[PDB]
């Protein structure tokens, strides 16, 4: 059959002719028989001398390690990263320094509401995270299949996400959460649209884009800076699931795009993406009609063209998932000299949210994980110890800066970029800014007719569910952004109610 | 809508004028605006001294914990056990004291192999535990709804879920692990049958019953001892659901079973179950045709009635499924005076595996969690501290045994029973008991025509995805237990192939 | 004896009459013998039935928890803070809305380097937290028995906290790595100068002095805010030990401090301390000859006279160490409306440094552990689950913010003081601030002959182990600071060597 | 100075010509400036884009893990095991198959009682661990100092160790507590008499013996079985420090232990031991006196001649303390074939103590930890996952056994011996037992009067300090070892009362 399902057959071919190795316990000590237990006669007691026993079932009962918070749900791969064009103008990165560079890469694709067990093709975001094994370390673009995000504030994250999952009493989805939260803050308009698109559910994860969503910074040789978006756009091409090919996949193969990715690998097709950027400049970002750092809008193309740097390429599958997909951990704030973050509020944010849920999820010393370790630069600093210290632990070397005794040197080099901001150090409310504008052009301009009817039969098709009061905030809502829009989804709504 | 769906809408009428709380921190310091972060300026970095914002975020990145090594999706609920007989000639047990008596019980359903996000109606045992808290302590009949299992050795469980769970390269369903390992250990066709037969799919948790499996020992107040088996039967009636409803549903509602349960409490219509135990005197232990502690076997009902002894009432829905159903803990090893372990290897593997885990997965004072305290008893011992110690750690008391200063005391009453046990003290082969005897009487009798038709379509339907050799090896067991057996399913394939 | 030795007599006394506790299981099991195994036979092998002992020998073996990365050694009291003055003009605080007013108050003293086998009189700055319980929630004021510190940029903590411990690959404490570090960072001067003074091993808790150390912001009902200092002198009045004393009590009696604490107040000898605070308004923080933020400079008394607020008083000794003592967590950043922290760059640091490495320590619902707990005020947040759930984890409550359906809402008064700060925002260098001005004025104008004569020998008799050119620099260094200073030390090093 | 000191030093000279290597974060990104944090403006608040500094300071913060609950004040060297004599006629295992076999072992010795900051030169046993790293996998030869114990049933040991450490409310040491227990449970007064001797105090690790303590059981090749004791004599001689140098060095060096064996290793002093084993047939531990599996009986040199094996030597200094030290465990459980357990309940109780310990100390896959890893060995099981995999994860390999697909094979030559057993499962009482004989002739015939002076002195020096009544009882046990014993003893008490 495919690949996947050959996944023990073509393990036992490559042993070919040669006889097993010994089963040991985890102390490496050979097992003469872990098929029955210790027992005092043939229907006696167990006895606690059966170490086999208890060594095995010890680390059984501790398989298990706390799924992701949010994009649970995934599948990997690995491959590389190429420069295809120069824009050292921008960024003096290493990872782009020259046309013709490979850089190794591994990517995670995910959903986001949905633990572990759930199914793929269901609507939902994307996530899209890329690891760069740079020589200046480890670069992480943590993206996702869409441009934009529902909030613009990094603190009602863990509201939009409670309202997204399940009720805390019941243990249910909950339209009313979902709809409460997103009538009560319009801002969130803009994606929601995307997401009840067409794109809302991606045919696998190789037809459909990536992007780093925020703005970025980067800097060059002369120590210029420049703010960007990063685009990776599908070389398969744009291809969604249809609401009822979707519903019938969730339940025939919860794992399409497990599947859909791991037997496309393995037969040499390897997908690809090309990489783009968005550049705007720090007098432009001045003159910018939105916030430049508003992660709810868009870069018009037509003002910021995308501008080639390379491709992303996926062509090697994983030999362990546990080991290199469930465990593998992407921080935002691992970014190399050359690239830096913008004052996108939702990026700060984040720059302190994924180090700190990864020391939980895998643990203090989670960059000691092989597929975590930056292992084409060398680590040197005066961190030490900490649960699982799974290397030398840098040796003897003196473990405090500054010293006289030759440890690590910070390098002036690698300095960050620096700004003058001004205005009061508080909480600035941006639950006003503008939140249909954009959203009105992507309804009329992005869609069609007939991807305009979808998208009000898809939103409606789920806000049925919610209370009255809120159907009517959500519409209001709506009809703020245009008139066809909130009246075809009312529409809709009287008939299922 | 049903009352699930009205949960937050209850929740708000049931603090009819009264004014909201303030939103404090986790410190409980007051919070003046918990819609923005602090930023140099409206387009300004983050700052740190915005611990509103890194004290909402930090608990946020650490809500996940691990889920279950196994049956990982359920649901839960409370009520009581009511004691209706007087078996007190078997056992001395506090819980069955005197006919009238009530002890509040707290249970858990589940299905087996899938993570947190999987369906509800899935092919699947199903997990029955229930959890007395009695003035002995507590007591967990960790029960299924089936009275026997797959295999009789605990040192095979950790194989046989890992097969029954995700290829460790592709993290998908893998045929040829299932009926493999299936195949290799023939002692699963009991458990088998019943699996893939109209029972596979229970119509929630409300109709199906619930077994403790294992034979236990009982011990009466003059220190005589009886071999027994625990079962409830369903007081809603036996009822299943077909494999094209199954299968709609598991996309339509995959939580099914936590909203039936859900809905059926809180609009009055409580599930109970009829509690009865079988009995064996050790003198028919000697005589049973088969191993009476083998699990891949049942005491047939001919030979040993249900004896009637009380009823399980559920009553109420969780308040906060996070902490009384997720953090649950069943211990088989929980056992109060009367009620004691049998040789069963199985059980005794359990003894060990389940506090085992919850040490793991709650923490080392998991027993001080809410849920999980014998509150109907004093925990009084030379037991302190622990990571998390939510108590007063029992005070300034001695903490040693023994001592003369008043501590804790043994009691004697509280003695177990001794068995005399002889015998070498080695691993006995288990593989080639009977596998087959029980189960034909189970495919001949238990099931019609009609029935037998449907359990190997159900067979062969999933069995068809593996590999013809395993095919072969699978049929041929089902051959030694009936040749319409083998070659009703070998039909099957035939045509599926 | 003293009432610290008679701790088992006296509580066996308590219960004169009573009769002992039944001894259980951690499950509430009762125990018929906890003093022999179960074997089969007299000299048979354990058998995994052995429920008892597999629970208690569990739990045994989870004990431990880390200890803090610093300040591990220490002891624990309780008692109350009451107001005496008012200063509602400075602070809305409800700690000091009314003269007479009481908050309960823990409190933990602590030495700085050794770890939790270590003796209490050695030469190390002592901690000083004090825990206030109030209606808006925790104040945690975590001090030092010193109103400076070592450094003034919290990014060198971590070093220098490691130059003061265990060499990485002999695990002894190494004089090299001491001072290494602080010749090559002379700002530590000022501390170092009163470490090795009189005060550096004072004679227990109770004589001494505590300081917040840091400057933090106070806002009255108005909105005013200005900047303070906080003092708590000892009633008991100051009195240390020689270093000879120190050194042979360290052998006597490596727990010192705890037993003379606990016997004081158990005898009814409860310390107290004066509650005062120095206040410097934004127009004085701008003539101030130093940066009054510079955790290396104090406010001259001259300039900036203590004001009186009110009493600290301790009359209550810990029922259990571990529960109350070893798991308390004081976290800089808990602040209640009315007091707020200062750009201190140490300050800053702490902000997010506590709350870290208490959920490392204890764990990410830390807060939920009693004597954590800020019990004088309601929680109501959107924060839900994580690792030892031990609370209704807010029961079914919207998880949500904003909701419509009445959860915990922001109270607005109490929106954080905002300031408008100017600069890049880049690392601005510190190591140059005058590290010699106060230190000198401490050695000419605070200290007499036979006070400096000692400083010298003290840091000398330490010094003198170091290598040669790190003594030359650490002479250079105190010889900028007095050139009395310098060469005295340099005249006791020589004969030394 | 000595080569501990110079560890620096020495650090800096081996990187003579090298530019000292580039300061990087934990992804590995280059570090420009980690001397000054980002902040808006020179004296403006912290900013979270400052990732250098909550990367360094998010790890700092998790440096510590929980310390061994017993034995946590320790020293670690590695070197090697050769074979000289052979006893292959006695066991199969590979460490003894031929003279001149070498294999690499890994050593800590260690204190019990007190915390990791405490002093070495105290009286307590001494913890003498050795982890060989043989090709059958490792062997943790788990001994101390003495070759018996203070008791003999498991269940007693949470209990004893609780007695020794601190009162659980003041939290000092408590001699109340520690009589309490001893005079209650006489058993102990064989080891209570080793402990009050001479060889209370050893002078360092180096000059103390060590023995597995408990009777094991070897295999040979044929499975023929005799019971055994192991033994490893001090080359470097019987050498003990008096109570007032111990004293004095607790004070001017807590560290002795670990700066003797560090400078003895380093300036080339490797010290070894002589290692031997006494041999008891079958038959003879039928004749033993007393039961030969009694942790508090020796087998007397007499009767078993001790039979010389070979040689321990340790060679190597650690490099990194905490990854090779602190992180390093040892299980008795980890036997090799031709090695195993003996009835003997303490051993049977530590068989599962330790590796439970250490899932919680270190982490669920401990073993993965470099020093711990059995690297002599090839690991291959179906044993998959958990917290902090820092391996393959072994790959794809399938994860189920059996199977058909080439995955690792029980191997029948590794089979545990067999022994036959007869009697009830039950718990047998021990405390009646002899405990004076052995300990009689200890003190009559292998002690002169110097010493029981001196043991006498050492005894009542610290009984003095406990109650009256249990100072009665301890003399009364005393009385029956010898009259002598307990009038000497009381004559004292009598003075220091
Ligand atoms: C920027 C530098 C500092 C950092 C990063 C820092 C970090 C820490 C950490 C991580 C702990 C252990 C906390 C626990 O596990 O409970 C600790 C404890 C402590 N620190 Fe700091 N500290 C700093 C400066 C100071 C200063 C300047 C003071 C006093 C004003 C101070 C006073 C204390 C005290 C008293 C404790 C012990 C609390 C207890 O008894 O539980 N620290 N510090
Ligand atoms: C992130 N989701
Ligand atoms: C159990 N499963
Ligand atoms: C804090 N030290
Ligand atoms: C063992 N200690």
Chains 1, 2, 3, 4 share one sequence.
């Not at 052009?441 to 009255?468: P, S, T, W």
Request: aromatic share 12%; hydrophobic share 35%.
């Amino acid at each position: 059959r495919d690949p996947a399902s050959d996944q023990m057959q073509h393990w036992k071919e490559q042993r070919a002719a040669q006889k097993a190795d010994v089963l040991t316990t985890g102390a490496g000590n050979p097992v003469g028989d872990k098929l029955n237990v210790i027992t005092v006669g043939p229907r006696g007691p167990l006895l606690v001398q059966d170490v086999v026993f208890t060594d095995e079932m010890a680390h059984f009962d501790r398989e298990r390690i706390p799924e992701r918070v949010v994009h649970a749900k995934g599948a990997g791969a690995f491959g590389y990263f190429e420069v295809t064009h120069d824009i050292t103008k921008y960024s003096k990165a290493k990872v782009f320094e020259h046309i013709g560079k490979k850089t190794p890469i591994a990517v995670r694709f995910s959903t986001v509401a949905g633990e572990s067990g759930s199914a793929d093709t269901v609507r939902d975001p994307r996530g899209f995270a890329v690891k760069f094994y740079t020589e200046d370390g480890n670069w992480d673009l943590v993206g996702n299949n869409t441009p934009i995000f529902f909030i613009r504030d990094p603190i009602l994250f863990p509201s939009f996400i409670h309202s997204q999952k399940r009720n805390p009493q019941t243990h249910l989805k909950d339209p009313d959460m979902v709809w409460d939260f997103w009538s009560l803050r319009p801002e969130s308009l803009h994606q929601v649209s995307f997401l009840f698109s067409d794109r809302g559910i991606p045919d696998g994860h190789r037809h459909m884009n990536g992007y780093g969503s925020h703005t970025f910074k980067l800097v060059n040789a002369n120590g210029e800076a420049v703010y960007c978006k990063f685009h990776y756009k599908t070389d398969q091409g744009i291809k969604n699931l249809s609401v009822e090919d979707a519903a019938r996949l969730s339940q025939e193969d919860p794992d399409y795009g497990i599947r859909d990715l791991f037997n496309a690998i393995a037969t040499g097709k390897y997908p690809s993406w090309t990489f783009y950027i968005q550049v705007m400049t720090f007098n432009q970002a001045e003159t910018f009609p939105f916030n430049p750092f508003d992660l709810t809008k868009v870069w018009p193309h037509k003002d910021y063209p995308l501008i080639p740097v390379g491709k992303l390429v996926l062509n090697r599958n994983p030999v362990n998932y546990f080991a290199e997909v469930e465990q593998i951990a992407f921080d935002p704030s691992n970014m190399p000299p050359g690239i830096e973050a913008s004052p996108d509020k939702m990026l700060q944010g984040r720059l302190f949210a994924y180090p700190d849920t990864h020391r939980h999820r895998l643990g203090p010393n989670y960059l000691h994980i092989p597929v975590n370790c930056p292992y084409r630069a060398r680590v040197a600093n005066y961190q030490r110890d900490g649960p699982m210290c799974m290397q030398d632990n840098q040796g003897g070397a003196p473990n405090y800066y500054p010293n006289s005794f030759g440890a690590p040197e910070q390098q002036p080099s690698a300095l960050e970029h620096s700004i003058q901001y001004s205005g009061e150090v508080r909480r600035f409310n941006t639950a006003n800014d503008d939140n249909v504008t954009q959203v009105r052009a992507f309804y009329v301009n992005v869609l069609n007719e007939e991807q305009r009817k979808r998208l009000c039969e898809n939103i409606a098709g789920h806000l049925k569910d919610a209370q009255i009061f809120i159907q009517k905030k959500a519409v209001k809502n709506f009809t703020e952004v245009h008139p066809d829009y909130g009246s075809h989804i009312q529409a809709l709504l009287d008939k299922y109610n």
